[PDB]
Every structure is written in structure tokens, then in C-alpha cells.
Amino acid sequence: GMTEYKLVVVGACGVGKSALTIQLIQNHFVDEYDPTIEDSYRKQVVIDGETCLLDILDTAGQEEYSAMRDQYMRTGEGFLCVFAINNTKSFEDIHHYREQIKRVKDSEDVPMVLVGNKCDLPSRTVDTKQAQDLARSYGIPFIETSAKTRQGVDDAFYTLVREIRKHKE
Ligand SMILES: *CCC(=O)N1CCN(c2ncnc3cc(-c4ccccc4F)c(Cl)cc23)CC1
Numbered sequence: 001g002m003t004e005y006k007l008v009v010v011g012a013c014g015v016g017k018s019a020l021t022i023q024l025i026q027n028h029f030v031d032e033y034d035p036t037i038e039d040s041y042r043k044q045v046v047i048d049g050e051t052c053l054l055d056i057l058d059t060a061g062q063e064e065y066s067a068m069r070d071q072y073m074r075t076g077e078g079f080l081c082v083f084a085i086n087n088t089k090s091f092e093d094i095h096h097y098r099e100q101i102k103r104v105k106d107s108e109d110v111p112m113v114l115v116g117n118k119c120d121l122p123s124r125t126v127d128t129k130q131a132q133d134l135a136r137s138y139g140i141p142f143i144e145t146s147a148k149t150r151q152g153v154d155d156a157f158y159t160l161v162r163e164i165r166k167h168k169e
């Protein structure tokens with residue numbers, strides 16, 4: 001039976017949670033995506049030779065009950081924590097997101113990956129070393145991505161699957 005990995009993409013508004021998710025799934029870059037739209041996507045991929053199904057929730061601004069969000073929080077196995085490299089505040093927000101994840105799973109050891117998105121942009125205010133230092137502190141990988149050019153998009157989600165596989169075994 002095909003293994004499924006339940007992934008949840010989190011981070012502050014505008015960092016590119018949706019654009020990352022839509023790029024991985026539909027192979028195009030979206031200029032606007034309703035920041036209030038929270039949806040789940042599936043895709044069949046092969047990762048290190050294992051055919052498997054990514055089940056991804058793109059979190060958003062939800063003042064309303066989502067039965068589907070409840071299930072991904074309860075049963076999600078890995079988190080993509082996204083900030084944007086031209087948004088210092090979104091980088092400062094990461095710690096908040098990591099603490100929420102630990103609380104949701106009631107553990108210090110939750111599979112997650114730090115993603116620095118929008119690295120196609122020149123106006124960079126969060127440098128790579130800051131992000132590596134934070135990732136090293138958390139004990140998690142750090143990947144630089146561009147939802148616009150596709151740089152690191154497969155790598156970020158695939159690295160997350162690999163962290164989940166290690167968590168299992
Ligand atoms: C621009 C709209 C958008 O993308 N968002 C608005 C809501 N966000 C938000 N703000 C603060 N705190 C959180 C915390 C969570 C969260 C809860 C539990 C576990 C993991 C986790 F990330 C989420 Cl999903 C969104 C938050 C950002 C998204």
C-alpha cells in the first residue's frame with residue numbers, strides 16, 4: 001500500500017505558503033491567492049525510490065472552524081515552517097510557529113523544516129547564516145526556496161518526508 005505523508009505548511013501571512021504549495025502541486029506560480037483560503041492538496045511522487053502520496057495542508061487565515069484543519073493538526077506528521085527572506089518580521093515569527101507545533105504534538109521532537117522563501121528577490125534582509133543558526137538551534141534542516149523560479153521547492157518538501165521517515169525509524 002502506498003505510504004502517505006501528512007504535511008502542514010505554516011508561517012506568517014504573505015511568506016508564500018500558498019505559492020509554494022501550488023508550485024509543488026500544479027507546477028505554476030500564483031500572483032495572488034486569497035489569504036483566507038485554507039485547502040489541502042495531494043500529489044503522488046517518488047522520493048528516494050519510494051512511491052508515496054504527499055497530503056499537504058496549506059494553512060491560512062481561519063476565523064472559522066475547519067474540520068479538515070483539525071485532522072491535519074491532530075494527524076499531520078511534519079511541518080514546513082516558512083518565512084520570506086525579505087520579511088524580517090516573518091523570520092522573527094518562526095519561534096512562535098515552532099512553539100505552537102510542539103504544543104500541538106506535545107513533543108520537542110516533531111519533524112519540521114525551516115524554509116526561507118522568495119530567494120529570487122534581491123532585497124534580502126534575513127541572511128542565510130541567521131537562518132542556518134536558527135535551524136541548527138532547533139535541530140532541523142534549512143532550505144532556501146523560490147516559489148516563483150522553483151528553486152528548492154521539491155527539496156523542501158522532500159527533506160520533510162525524509163525527516164518524517166527518520167522519526168518513524
Ligand atoms: C495571511 C493569512 C495567513 O496566512 N495566516 C493567518 C493566521 N496565521 C497565524 N497567526 C498566528 N498564529 C498561527 C498559528 C498557527 C498554528 C497553530 C498550531 C500549530 C501550528 C501552527 F502553525 C497557524 Cl496554522 C497560523 C497562525 C498565519 C497564517
Ligand SMILES: Nc1nc2c(ncn2[C@@H]2O[C@H](COP(=O)(O)OP(=O)(O)O)[C@@H](O)[C@H]2O)c(=O)[nH]1
Pocket residue numbers: 011012013014015016017018019020030031032033035117118119120121145146147148149
Ligand atoms: N518573488 C517571489 N514572490 C513570491 C514568492 N512566493 C510568494 N510570492 C508572492 O508573495 C505573495 C504571498 O504569497 P502567498 O503564497 O499568498 O503567501 P501566504 O499567505 O503565506 O500563503 C503572493 O503575491 C505571491 O505571488 C517567491 O518565492 N518569490
Ligand SMILES: [Mg+2]
Pocket residue numbers: 017018019033034035037059060
Ligand atoms: Mg496563503
